[PDB]
Amino acid sequence: AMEKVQYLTRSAIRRASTIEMPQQARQNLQNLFINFALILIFLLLIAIIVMLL
Numbered sequence: 001a002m003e004k005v006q007y008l009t010r011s012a013i014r015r016a017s018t019i020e021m022p023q024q025a026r027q028n029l030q031n032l033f034i035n036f037a038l039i040l041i042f043l044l045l046i047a048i049i050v051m052l053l
Helices: 028-051
Strands: none
Touching: none
């Protein structure tokens, strides 16, 4: 084979649960965690503008 991008060679035995890529997410737990965080900060926002304001 020939390398064209380092995404599987760079830090292969060092990166653990992190990724060496120009793409912020590649696995669905990353995607669903940010989805849950968006839901939770949206819930916090609407709690404030209904109960503090």
